[PDB]
Amino acid sequence: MKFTVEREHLLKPLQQVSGPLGGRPTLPILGNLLLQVADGTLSLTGTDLEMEMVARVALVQPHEPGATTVPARKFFDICRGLPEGAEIAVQLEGERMLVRSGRSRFSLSTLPAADFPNLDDWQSEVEFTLPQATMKRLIEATQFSMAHQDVRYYLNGMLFETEGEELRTVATDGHRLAVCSMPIGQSLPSHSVIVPRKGVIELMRMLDGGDNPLRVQIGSNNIRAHVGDFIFTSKLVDGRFPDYRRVLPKNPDKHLEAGCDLLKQAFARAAILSNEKFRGVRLYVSENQLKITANNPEQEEAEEILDVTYSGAEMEIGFNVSYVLDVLNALKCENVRMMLTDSVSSVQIEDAASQSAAYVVMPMRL
Amino acid sequence: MKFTVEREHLLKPLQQVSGPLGGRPTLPILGNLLLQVADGTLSLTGTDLEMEMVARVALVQPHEPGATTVPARKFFDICRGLPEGAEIAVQLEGERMLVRSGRSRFSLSTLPAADFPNLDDWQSEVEFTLPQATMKRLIEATQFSMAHQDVRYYLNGMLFETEGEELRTVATDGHRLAVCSMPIGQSLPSHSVIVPRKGVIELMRMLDGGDNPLRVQIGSNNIRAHVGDFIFTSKLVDGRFPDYRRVLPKNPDKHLEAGCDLLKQAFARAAILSNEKFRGVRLYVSENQLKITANNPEQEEAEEILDVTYSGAEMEIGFNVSYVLDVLNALKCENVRMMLTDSVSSVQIEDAASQSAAYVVMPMRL
């Protein structure tokens, strides 16, 4: 195995394949990448056994086939460390990989390609392509509400749902919920999969937003995404994501419209004096006024009054201000619409101009 | 007490004085700021019993004199969170401090000014003033060599030495040393003072590199620095600091010049395959050539060859590469010079064009 590549052809591949590497890689070959030259294609693979990222770089210069596994972080840093535009020449000499460029020379140990983990062949069931852009908005819009490490392991992930010509992601904690659905331009059978949060972070990071279409294939226990030259395949978590259509409020008769930045600035200032643990802020809404107020254990008090569009009956509701700040930071839009019912129902928040995403935070009795 | 100020006049004071304050100290007043209106002035004071930072801001609007103590971090976040151009009105009411701005209203708990640690009055002994920019040079050129948590408590600090019309700083941890000396244009006594790692981090922090004189007053156990309307005083530490003149190589016969970024890019790359514990590298130096080699337990190796100006005997010398990477990064220059004696002795490194700063790193045996 010998190949010669330009540094810059190796760099974004190498960065991408090194994502899945992480979790205290006890089985040492997982800290390594699989390099294969076959045809005039170098493929690099990296896996954490639950997901896999493959990148292909075509080889225009002379090469010789074979396969081996190099230390990932060390090969990444040597290439990033060489100068811009450098020709890096790799060559496996027996059990060591030789990297030479200009006047530098490196020898890395190799672990055998034949020990590198293989994820099983599986078969596709649903397949569709969509602009990278749509998959980006869908994940960004909701990822913040996924659980992190929960006993309800199925919440540590994101629901991908197809229905009609809509792809829909939903993510929840068990506390707050985010939903985003976008039209995909192809009739699709109804499907639901939960992809593990590590996997949706990796998928998020392979999307550059540029012009290569993203193509996804879904099998019974795996998902695969092909963008240009990279291929990501992860498995799915086994099941029963709660029904998000039940947490949504049933007919909120009250609406409040307000600029996202003003509303965000006032809750971030009121949050400074709320209870550190529970973050409860109390809301009083009345004809064209919103008053936010916060108290904390040491009897300190914050109070914010603002002009809001709201015509309707007066009410109070308290909620955890971190959850609502999270959604106002995900809502990168001019105006926000908050839809309320009463002091004892959840509230829905959306952009006042796109019902595409909907976020629901529960009430707290403060 | 009652005063009214423009957020912008209040904010850099608030940040300079909060900076060092422990969020929740074990003696609570130490997490508050003393606020005093007297004469036409607000003085904000934060201390930790080791140092004290004082800011004054001129009060051009109505005010009423008095003193109180407010939670530092909260007050800073409330002022930072308010819109740009806000006029904040602070009024003491009972044992709450009321902060009003627009329609935002906050009420902060108060601890009494009487309880606030009065630091000690001391007599100045040597005084001099100098460009803020020379002081920031003197400290930046040297601070990365101070020890952090060394048992020889006097190394966790920086020595400021007055001799003639020069001010000098030296820092060392027993393994490498940095010296920087600059003309201050005033005849000074001959005096040395060790100021603590924390006091030099804070003095560097307030040196908003202007035109402005800095006046410094050294006492027997304190140092004070006045720049603008900020006054910083720190206690000093006692021990017998090392003499940099005994550390500096006697007469380095051999000299080598090389471009600093080439030198540095090459040591950062050999560093990748260096033993993780020792970070040891080997230089072989010969006529107009330098070869850097590193290797680790895993039996990986790195080799870099570069062209340098060297006329002199061949030599092999080993260093810890973190120690020379740290001086190449501090030295912000085009060509560097290494002055070597032999394999068993220190090497001096300095900018090839300046001599105000000099760094000596001891060799290793790998």
Curated annotation (Swiss-Prot), chains A, B:
Q: Please list the residues that bind DNA.
A: R24, R73, Q149, Y153, Y154
Q: What is the effect of changing M135L?
A: 3-fold reduction of synthesis of beta*, probably due to loss of its start codon
Annotated SUPFAM superfamilies: DNA clamp (SSF55979)
Q: What is this protein called?
A: Beta sliding clamp
Q: Which GO terms describe its biological process?
A: bacterial-type DNA replication; DNA damage response; DNA strand elongation involved in DNA replication; DNA-templated DNA replication; error-prone translesion synthesis; negative regulation of DNA-templated DNA replication initiation; regulation of DNA-templated DNA replication initiation
Q: According to the record, what induces this protein's expression?
A: Part of the dnaA-dnaN-recF-gyrB operon, but also transcribed from at least 3 promoters within the upstream dnaA gene, induced at 42 degrees Celsius. Induced 1.5-fold by hydroxyurea. A shorter isoform, beta* is induced by UV treatment and also at low levels in late logarithmic/early stationary phase growth (at protein level). Beta* transcription induced by naldixic acid.
Its annotated function is as follows: Confers DNA tethering and processivity to DNA polymerases and other proteins. Acts as a clamp, forming a ring around DNA (a reaction catalyzed by the clamp-loading complex) which diffuses in an ATP-independent manner freely and bidirectionally along dsDNA. DNA bound in the ring is bent 22 degrees, in solution primed DNA is bound more tightly than dsDNA, suggesting the clamp binds both ss- and dsDNA. In a complex of DNA with this protein, alpha, epsilon and tau subunits however the DNA is only slightly bent.
Alphabetized InterPro entries for the sequence: DNA_clamp_sf (IPR046938), DNA_polIII_beta (IPR001001), DNA_polIII_beta_C (IPR022635), DNA_polIII_beta_cen (IPR022637), DNA_polIII_beta_N (IPR022634)
Q: Where is this region: 1?
A: 1-120
Q: Which SMART domains match?
A: POL3Bc
Q: Where is this region: 2?
A: 129-243
